Amino acid sequence: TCPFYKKIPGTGFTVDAFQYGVVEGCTAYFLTHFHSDHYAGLSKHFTFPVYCSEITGNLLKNKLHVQEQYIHPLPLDTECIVNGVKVVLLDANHCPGAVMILFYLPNGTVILHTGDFRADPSMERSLLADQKVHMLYLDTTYCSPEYTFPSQQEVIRFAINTAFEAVTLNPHALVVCGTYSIGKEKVFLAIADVLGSKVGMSQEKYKTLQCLNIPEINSLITTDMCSSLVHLLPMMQINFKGLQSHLKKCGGKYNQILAFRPTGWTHSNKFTRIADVIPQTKGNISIYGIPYSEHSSYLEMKRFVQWLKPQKIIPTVNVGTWKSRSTMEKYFREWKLEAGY
Numbered sequence: 067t068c069p070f071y072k073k074i075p076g077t078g079f080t081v082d083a084f085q086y087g088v089v090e091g092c093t094a095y096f097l098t099h100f101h102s103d104h105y106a107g108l109s110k111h112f113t114f115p116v117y118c119s120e121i122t123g124n125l126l127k128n129k130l131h132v133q134e135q136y137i138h139p140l141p142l143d144t145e146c147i148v149n150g151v152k153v154v155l156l157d158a159n160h161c162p163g164a165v166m167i168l169f170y171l172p173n174g175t176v177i178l179h180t181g182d183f184r185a186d187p188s189m190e191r192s193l194l195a196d197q198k199v200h201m202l203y204l205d206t207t208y209c210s211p212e213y214t215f216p217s218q219q220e221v222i223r224f225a226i227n228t229a230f231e232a233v234t235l236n237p238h239a240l241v242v243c244g245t246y247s248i249g250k251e252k253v254f255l256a257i258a259d260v261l262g263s264k265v266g267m268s269q270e271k272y273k274t275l276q277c278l279n280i281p282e283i284n285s286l287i288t289t290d291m292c293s294s295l296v297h298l299l300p301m302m303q304i305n306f307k308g309l310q311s312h313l314k315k316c317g318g319k320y321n322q323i324l325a326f327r328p329t330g331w332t333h334s335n336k337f338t339r340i341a342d343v344i345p346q347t348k349g350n351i352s353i354y355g356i357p358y359s360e361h362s363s364y365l366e367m368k369r370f371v372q373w374l375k376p377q378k379i380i381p382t383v384n385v386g387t388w389k390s391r392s393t394m395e396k397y398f399r400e401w402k403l404e405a406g407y
């Protein structure tokens with residue numbers, strides 16, 4: 067059965083609610099983004115209307131086989147009527163195709179559902195500027211002050227400089243980057259660009275990237291591993307064993323691997339600056355964990371919420387323990403007392 071924080075009151079609508087069977091009274095199922103915890107339950111046998119971005123629609127059709135007649139893509143930054151209710155989709159600054167959803171309810175209430183997002187000051191100049199929000203359904207993944215990490219631009223700067231130095235010292239080094247879902251593609255695209263290479267990958271991953279409307283993609287990626295000196299591998303293989311095994315398959319073209327594991331936050335963020343990050347090394351294999359986040363830091367979340375001044379906040383992450391819920395409610399009250407709303 068569908069929990070309350072996935073229902074939109076006064077509508078026939080649900081958000082990211084595909085794992086509960088037929089939800090009673092649901093006339094339209096919204097999907098914020100193509101991450102498996104959120105799409106859990108969708109397949110080619112789904113027969114209700116799905117509302118989403120163009121990019122999420124390409125992934126539902128090609129990767130999960132959902133039939134076309136049930137896919138309803140909406141443009142961004144555009145007022146749309148769905149089953150008699152005005153809605154707007156906004157870029158969430160998460161993975162490709164990820165949206166926030168503004169709902170203008172028949173009684174005058176306005177609801178923002180962030181999906182998953184990385185709050186940014188540029189959101190203060192979207193269609194959010196114009197009007198009041200009564201309820202905020204908020205991605206609270208990192209809602210605690212210990213959760214700090216750098217900007218995505220600093221992280222990318224570190225990765226490009228590290229890869230360019232290693233391969234210039236040793237032209238026979240291979241670079242490998244881990245992946246397990248969509249998102250974070252800037253990591254491997256920026257590294258391949260500085261190295262003058264396409265990115266090599268499996269047919270399955272190529273198919274997924276082909277759904278993403280990335281400009282000039284055909285010039286950036288390939289399934290011909292032999293032509294490429296940046297390879298993608300599943301995240302599970304980014305360890306000394308998996309990487310040894312990969313280097314054997316490359317036919318003595320390379321004598322060294324430099325690898326990247328994009329994570330979210332890890333406790334080594336509480337001590338070490340991005341500049342000071344060092345790898346794990348065994349022999350001719352080095353593995354860097356880099357903190358590339360597609361979710362708000364605590365500070366970015368607090369700034370967003372203090373700017374929007376919602377009347378009520380409903381968290382959508384970390385909702386399963388009393389201690390988590392109590393912690394998040396304390397911070398919401400500090401934020402409100404500090405800013406005066």
Ligand code: NI
Pocket residue numbers: 099101160182
């Ligand atoms: Ni996500």
